[PDB]
């Protein structure tokens, strides 16, 4: 209680001591990226209902897309050919992940179940490999580390590392107090950051099971979270219509990306291969490209007729896919 | 077509996938999705558990009762921003839980994601409410003082065998939920109050007619006739 608030103000004053300058002051001399005019190069039509999630495969050619009609469609972006179409038991799916190997694809939602689907079977049909069922809330995000390990965030305020083979939660993460909405695995796949509705973002250790650091600053639910390519910074997106880049080592927010005109929350956030650009999808039926270092809106990807639910940048950084409640997905480039 | 033999076969696979998707699209359009909100003891399950399907006049309706998630509900209500209606069941008998239900209705009615979605309120257990009024027990004025000042409206349609006391009680609850719905929203969405009971099995027909009116009103703006 008293010790608790003492420790709290202690942490606060430490961060302040480390706040010698600002990212803005530092990059004041860095030349702006300039206007980033990106045009829709492909439009993947075929989903019947609102697209709620998407994930690029490591090959940067295939991507899975979830919809409220209960269908996960794998698309060959290069040729706009639907590779596979998986019917899902629960129509209400809020998340979809693509395995780094490409052998599996997992989805989850208000079913409170994370179903892993083996894409490459001898029978030639996509079949549900395992149905993880421990979580007690809607699963909001699921990201694969192995073809045998997957971290899933849930509205039960808890995240969990699972062993696909056994079907048991190897590790649970119960630090958050509000519905965890997003999770982002570090490039090194040793740490994962999760943003929740408690306006808090906690960095976790996947093998120790403990919350290493806790970052605050958003005034509302952190709807989206993403990791900077170096694995030393993470950017967040909240209903506060603000995006904030927190540095892991400094333990302190570096820059905030807000514009007076923007009054709609961020649904999805993502960085470029270099991390210079922070592409975030707002509820204004469009996505804004923000120069991360200079905190200036470089460009706008406006081609959607509904809330841009998901945004993903290819691993090769060649293209940016954007899924919307308009049942369409556009590969901007 | 500058496509290899394997490319052509992949395009063919995509076309067959597209065909099954089209048949699926037809079923999706025909099915009208409904969201069964409501608290416990409301008997939400017995009006007609995560999902329930029923068909009236060759029109199939899918009713989704999401009771697995509690506490903050706005986060998962974003998913049901396309349902044709939100069946909301209220236990008229319990007045202690009534104020909570009013708060829930207010939240649902004002939810930014449900600002164009209509609500078919089904005051349930109207029988139990009557028994409480007949026996007196807890006065409704105790829970809501306005009940004394309240009088049965002229527009009210008294059912046969309804003591004016029982009648005033029923329309008092309806008045509260109407008051809640009239304050917010601007003709974008409407509330359809239907006094219902446990034995009452005509509930499915009420849903049907109310759904017709809602879709008619939307088609009247979609075809630009308004």
């Amino acid at each position: 209680r008293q010790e608790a608030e003492q420790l709290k103000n202690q942490i606060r004053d430490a961060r302040k001591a480390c706040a010698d300058a600002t990212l803005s002051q530092i990059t004041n001399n860095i030349d702006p990226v300039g206007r980033i005019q990106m045009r829709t190069r492909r439009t993947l039509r075929g989903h019947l209902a609102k697209i709620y999630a998407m994930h690029w495969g490591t090959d940067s050619r295939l991507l899975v897309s979830a919809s409220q009609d209960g269908k996960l469609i794998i698309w060959d972006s290069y040729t706009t050919n639907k590779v596979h179409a998986i019917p899902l038991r629960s129509s209400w799916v809020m998340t979809c992940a693509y395995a780094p190997s490409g052998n599996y694809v997992a989805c989850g939602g208000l079913d409170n179940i994370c179903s892993i689907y083996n894409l490459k079977t001898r029978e030639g049909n996509v079949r549900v490999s395992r149905e993880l069922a421990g979580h007690t809330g809607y699963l909001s995000c699921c990201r694969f580390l192995d073809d045998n390990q997957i971290v899933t965030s849930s509205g039960d305020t808890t995240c969990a590392l699972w062993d696909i083979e056994t079907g048991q939660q190897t590790t649970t993460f119960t630090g958050h107090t509000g519905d965890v909405m997003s999770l982002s695995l570090a490039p090194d796949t040793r740490l994962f950051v999760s943003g929740a509705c408690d306006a808090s973002a906690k960095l976790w250790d996947v093998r120790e099971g403990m919350c290493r650091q806790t970052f605050t600053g958003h005034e509302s639910d952190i709807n989206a979270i993403c990791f900077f390519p170096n694995g030393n910074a993470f950017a967040t997106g909240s209903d506060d219509a603000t995006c904030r880049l927190f540095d892991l080592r400094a333990d302190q927010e570096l820059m905030t990306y807000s514009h007076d005109n923007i009054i709609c929350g961020i649904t999805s956030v993502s960085f470029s291969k270099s991390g210079r650009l922070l592409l975030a999808g707002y509820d204004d039926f469009n996505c804004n490209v923000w120069d991360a270092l200079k905190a200036d809106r470089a460009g706008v990807l406006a081609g959607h007729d509904n809330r841009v639910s998901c945004l993903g940048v290819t691993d090769d950084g060649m293209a940016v896919a954007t899924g919307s409640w308009d049942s369409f997905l556009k590969i901007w480039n | 077509c500058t496509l290899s033999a394997e490319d052509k076969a992949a395009v063919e696979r995509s076309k067959m996938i597209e065909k099954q998707l089209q048949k699926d699209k037809q079923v999706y359009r025909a099915t009208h999705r409904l969201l069964l909100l409501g608290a416990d003891n409301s008997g939400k399950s017995t009006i007609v558990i995560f999902e329930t399907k029923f068909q009236v006049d060759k029109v199939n309706f899918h009713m989704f009762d999401v009771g697995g998630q509690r506490d903050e509900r706005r986060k998962w209500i974003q998913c049901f921003n396309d349902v044709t209606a939100i069946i909301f069941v209220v236990d008229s008998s319990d007045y202690n839980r009534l104020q909570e239900a009013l708060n829930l209705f207010k939240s649902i009615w004002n939810n930014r994601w449900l600002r164009t979605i209509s609500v078919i309120l089904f005051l349930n257990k109207q029988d139990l409410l009557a028994e409480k009024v007949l026996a007196g027990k807890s006065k409704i004025e105790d829970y809501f003082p306005e009940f004394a000042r309240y009088t049965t409206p002229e527009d009210a349609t008294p059912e046969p065998g309804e003591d004016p006391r029982v009648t005033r009680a029923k329309y008092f609850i309806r008045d509260e939920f109407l008051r809640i719905s009239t304050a917010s929203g601007d003709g974008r969405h409407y509330c359809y109050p239907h006094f219902t009971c446990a034995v009452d099995t005509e509930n499915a027909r009420r849903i049907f007619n109310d759904c017709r009116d809602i879709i008619q009103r939307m088609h009247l703006r979609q075809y630009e006739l308004l």
Partner: single-chain antibody, 232 residues
């Protein structure tokens, strides 16, 4: 388990007609486009017919064009080949092959056992060495040349390698020039230049004895190579 048992073969007087039937079990027959490939008693493989998923695109070979017809009964999981005007040149064992086509697929993966029928412009695949003697533990390099570069603009070289172990149906070893097939030891490696290709089998074992065929999938008719035998 995936099985493709075909039946309906036997002695037929010239000019007769017979229907070959391949019963499928253990896979989604509907999703897999099927092919019929025959092997003359002493010669190599020759693509006969191909029916796509959903009985859409049905290509045939010039030799059997018109005389033969391939049909698929998706509900009954069966592939049929009604052959008419059976000439003495149609005496061969017919194999039903499954082939699914999607980005990253392994076409021609499973071959059926085979049924024997005894009758009383296209790219040329040239396997120069008919035979190559080799002892176990050594490394071989079966070569196959092509009339046209099999490298399509899509960047995929469509050259497939198959192994027919004595008394056994062919088995896909390398698909699309380099991609190794599932269940195949890593000792097999595929190299290609667009026109000339080479299958390197390192640390040869006893299992690797058999004939090796190079098939092109750039365009139909699909053309198999004469075959290079590896004798112990």
């Amino acid at each position: 388990d995936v099985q493709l048992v075909e039946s309906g073969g036997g002695l037929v007087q010239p000019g007769g007609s017979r229907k070959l039937s391949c019963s499928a079990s253990g896979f989604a027959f509907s999703s897999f486009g099927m092919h019929w490939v025959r092997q003359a008693p002493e010669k190599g493989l020759e693509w006969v017919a191909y029916i796509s998923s959903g009985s859409g695109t049905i290509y045939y070979a010039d030799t059997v064009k018109g005389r033969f017809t391939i049909s698929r009964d998706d509900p009954k999981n069966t592939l049929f080949l009604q052959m008419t005007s059976l000439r003495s040149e149609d005496t061969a064992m017919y194999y039903c092959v499954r082939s699914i086509y999607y980005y990253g697929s392994s076409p021609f993966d499973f071959w059926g056992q085979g049924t024997t029928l005894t009758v009383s412009s296209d790219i040329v695949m040239t396997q120069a060495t008919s035979s190559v003697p080799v002892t176990p533990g050594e490394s071989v390099s079966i070569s196959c040349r092509s009339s046209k570069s099999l490298l399509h603009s899509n960047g995929n070289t469509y050259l497939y390698w198959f192994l027919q172990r004595p008394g056994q149906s062919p088995q896909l070893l390398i698909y699309r020039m380099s991609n190794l097939a599932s269940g195949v030891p890593d000792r097999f490696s595929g190299s290609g230049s667009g026109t000339a290709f080479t299958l390197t089998i390192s640390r040869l074992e006893a299992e690797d004895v058999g004939v090796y065929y190079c098939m092109q999938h750039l365009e139909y008719p699909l053309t198999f190579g004469a075959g290079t035998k590896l004798e112990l």
